Amino acid sequence: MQIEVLIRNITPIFSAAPGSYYVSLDGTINPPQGASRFPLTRARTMTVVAETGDGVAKAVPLPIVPGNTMRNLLRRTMLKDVIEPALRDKSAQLSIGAYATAYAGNSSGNPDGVPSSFDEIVTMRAHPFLGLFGGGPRMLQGRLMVDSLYPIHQFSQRIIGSDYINDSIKGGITEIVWTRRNDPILQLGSPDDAAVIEGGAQAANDWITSLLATTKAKKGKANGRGLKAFNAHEVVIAGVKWLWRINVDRPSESQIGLILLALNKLANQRIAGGHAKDYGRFVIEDVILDGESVWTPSGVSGQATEQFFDAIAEALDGMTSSEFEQFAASAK
Amino acid sequence: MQIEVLIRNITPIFSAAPGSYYVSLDGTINPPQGASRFPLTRARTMTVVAETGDGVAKAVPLPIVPGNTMRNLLRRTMLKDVIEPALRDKSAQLSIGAYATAYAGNSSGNPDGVPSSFDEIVTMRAHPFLGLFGGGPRMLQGRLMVDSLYPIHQFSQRIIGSDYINDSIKGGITEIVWTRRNDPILQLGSPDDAAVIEGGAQAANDWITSLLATTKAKKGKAGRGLKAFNAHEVVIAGVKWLWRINVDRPSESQIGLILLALNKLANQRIAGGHAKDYGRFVIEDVILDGESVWTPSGVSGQATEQFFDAIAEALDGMTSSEFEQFAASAK
Amino acid sequence: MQIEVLIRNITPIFSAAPGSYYVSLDGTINPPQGASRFPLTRARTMTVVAETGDGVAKAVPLPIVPGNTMRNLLRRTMLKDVIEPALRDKSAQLSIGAYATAYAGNSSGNPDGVPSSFDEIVTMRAHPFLGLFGGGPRMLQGRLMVDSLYPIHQFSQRIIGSDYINDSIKGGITEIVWTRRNDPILQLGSPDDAAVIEGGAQAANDWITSLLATTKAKKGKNGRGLKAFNAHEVVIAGVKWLWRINVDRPSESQIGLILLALNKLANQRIAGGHAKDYGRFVIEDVILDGESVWTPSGVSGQATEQFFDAIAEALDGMTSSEFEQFAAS
Amino acid sequence: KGAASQNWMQTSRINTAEAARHRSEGFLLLRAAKPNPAGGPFKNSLYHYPLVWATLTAYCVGDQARIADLLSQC
DNA sequence: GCGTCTCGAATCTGATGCGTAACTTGGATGCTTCGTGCGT
DNA sequence: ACGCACGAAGACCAAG
């Protein structure tokens, strides 16, 4: 089954791209060495082939959110909001290994390397949760094919198709945000402010003297680091529409219902990093279930989704920690 | 746990954008090099997608106050008005590292690579203050999600929603203020005026002639004097802003602390322009998970009584040991 | 009978290349020993000779999907979509030998080696499915000869040809995707999060203590934790590929089965990356001996009507006994 | 050889998920509880063969026309 | 059911710091026979 | 009675 979810980000989305980048005050990435450069954490981009207005196809970078991040977002929503409430309602306790297996796929970094029995595989792949994600010490194949988050853009037309052209945005959708850190002891201006500090004025003077000496040493040399920092990070602007495509390999109605419940409770979560700055906030606009729209103002609802919700409710009522414990158990 | 705050700025808000921009005398930003190019300090804007009324999405610049600025404003308000007075009553003194960690999230730029124990995480995430603002040598994740300050504009309806449409403003909300610096000696033109200067008229004459020589050398060439003419760009006064503060699973004490900070938030300025009294604002409304809890005398009502009681009890039980444990490095 | 299948990948295609490769945070493959190294799982590449700036052609790595992978993909499509349902409609049951022969060409059903008579060879090499993919104890030669998935690229013009110069890409078509695994216990923030764990806070404390001890011991100097940071190379999305399938002397049934699989091929993935939804694609053109037989609704038209009728008749009269006889069980 | 030989790796495996599903649904008649990737019907195998770009040249005594006609179908 | 002269000029036309930190740094599997029970 | 199933076992050098 193919699920396409339409997402609009209320707040900017920030997915850090690994690797050191530098930007100048003007806003030029990796500036010439003559000017001053500041560390920059760029938003993750995926190179894609786009047919621009010229008619030729060229590889262009596209700011996206990784499919692994979206998969973990779905898994965390499912666990924290559907599975774990049921387990606690029935007073079901997972072991630490079962917990780590449910939240990260495996309970350690060493796969067993021993095959699973056929009945065990059938039992797990029919499970509402372990069937979708799989993993475990005996690395099982899940049913969930979860994709990245591609913005509806001129550059993503060849990927996501041309049925969302009305939501397409032409120009760059990426913005740079500058961040500062200050030394608190430098903003003291009265003995009252330093009264809460043990030692007080003497401690503040010692701190400032050490800071001055360290700054002079660093200037001359051009090993602790101070609290003064000025850097930037790159974010996707707020208000851009994204397409999320979820495929599931022949699922039972319980698994479809579980995915639908996660989608219903997904907007309460946040897509990527940027917790302090309230990044990653979004709202779901339309959820398409096998080519048909099943999204209402309330959420995923309608007559077509009743069977999935009933099946997942029954599965949750019958769900116990035994399946998780058996899945997470190691043969050796 | 969602808090929406409606803020109207009494005085212009000046959140400077890093980078050297230039403005001509007639208000054109980055003018052609033929004309004059007095420097300009631009108000910070964040590109946002907005519908211009024609049904087409457009990326337009929207002047905002950064979320980091407002988060530090909240942290400083809490520390200066609630946490420290509670600490002062018991004569509990934070160490220099603990104070630095409380006010900036760390005591040094080098974090510890180890993860903090679960007991420490449970102890700190339940703390009224350190739970909200994470950090420390071990990267604890705080419960506070502070967003940027978005003006209620036509360009921010796609972001702040349509709940506040009567407070929206259509045109540009940004203006240029021209700032000038004089040379006191040039304005000094009486013998009594120079009577207070060491050397009397000789020192002023030396100053003026040295200034003339430096100016002539600099003009011929094609240390900097005192005379200046610049411009800084501010958001006009009277615009309404929406501040969105989100907290994930807070205790009663933490919500009480946030509401206490919001009660005394207007006593502090938002960003920039301390000399010129910029950043002054008044809170129009505080929405507490869809419920308006703002009274004319602050956040009041039975709906908020338990939060205030919980935070009062927590402050009465507040000791510096939590701060010292939080700020202590594990290596 | 040549089949030319033009394929455009919606999502990146990840065919993991064997071997231990390393990359740094900046993206440098196999960095010097000075900097930190992270494991990398590169995409499959075939060394081909290409005219790099004219002059003298030099060997360049061309990212492809191996021909065996797509042979098995066609086999799996046939079985899952038109063969296994057909056998279920008859309530057919396959032994282990017949199943192994059908799904992997294995000879474990009767590894002694069985002599095939000429009449038997005629009967079984004309089987709509088993004729295309030979094997089993008989090890009959299959009628199918599929090629690898070569992208329409500047370096593949000597393999693909100059027939698709309009859909060619000049730059590199690979990228590095970084993957991270987190320890879930390190991300607990309250006893509410630890309620579902049997040990509560004590189990999490023991887990974190053991993790700290192991990390310190490894730093000073067995078991591995959950935290991991690694990378893998995928072929970027949108690149066009050309797939060539050939048959030596097909019956109508075998060509019809090929066309049915092509109609149902887009439902499957290419290479690996099932978790990340890697290998999604759309068929853009199927060419049957120089004529285009692809419509928006799939392979259709009058030019391919005989094959579909023949394969429908063969499927209706399909019995598990043919599979058992082919497997010599 | 126009280029160095490349060691081409190929494998062979039966999907254990599909096999288990078929065993459950009765399509496959297997009584064994678990697969054995080391050997048996569900064995994974790893093998390699080299790939070379080459110009094949050989010398023969025979009819040019018929040899060229035979090689036309190759 | 009135207009000329006037209809500017000269500066200024930034300055300083900050200008990263810590971890992660892979894992497992690709044999077949022989003996002893256990399902058709 | 006969075929299938399941575990123990035995070759073992060993790098850049």
What is the compact description of this entry?
The structure is cut from a larger assembly and holds 3 copies of chain A and 1 copy of chain D (about 70 residues). Chain A has about 325 residues and is an alpha+beta fold. Chain A has helices at about 65-90, 95-105, 120-125, 130-135, 155-160, 200-220, 255-265, 305-320, 320-330, and strands at about 1-10, 20-25, 40, 45-50, 55-65, 145-150, 175-180, 230-235, 240-250, 280-290, 290-295.
Attribute tags:
part of a larger assembly, 4 chains, A: 332 residues, alpha+beta, five-stranded antiparallel beta sheet, four-stranded mixed beta sheet, 9 helices, 21% strand, D: 74 residues, 2 helices, 3 strands, 26% helix, DNA-binding, CRISPR type AFERR-associated protein Csf2 (chain C), CRISPR-assoc_prot_Csf2 (chain C), CRISPR type AFERR-associated protein Csf3 (chain D)
CA-atom Rg of chain A in angstroms: 25 Å
Compute the number of helices of chain D.
Answer: 2
Helix content of chain A: 25-40%
E-strand count of chain D: 3
How much β-strand is present in the residues of chain D? 15-25%
Category by helix and strand content of chain A: alpha+beta
Shape of chain A: globular
Provide a count of the helices of chain A. Answer: 9
The ordered H/E elements of chain A are: EEEEEHHHHEHEHEEHEEHH
Instruction: Give the strand order, joined by hyphens, for the main sheet of chain D.
Output: 1-3
Strand element count of chain A: 11
N- to C-terminal distance of chain D: 21 Å
Oligomer: part of a larger assembly
**Rg of chain D, nearest Å:** 23 Å
Tell me about the largest β-sheet of chain A: 5 strands, antiparallel
Q: Sketch the major β-sheet of chain D.
A: 2 strands, antiparallel
Q: Decide which structural class fits the backbone of chain D.
A: alpha+beta
- Major sheet: arrangement of strands of chain A: 6-9-1-10-11
Question: Which percent band covers the strand fraction of chain A?
Answer: 15-25%
Protein name (chain C): CRISPR type AFERR-associated protein Csf2
Protein name (chain D): CRISPR type AFERR-associated protein Csf3
Organism (chain D): Ectopseudomonas oleovorans (Pseudomonas oleovorans)
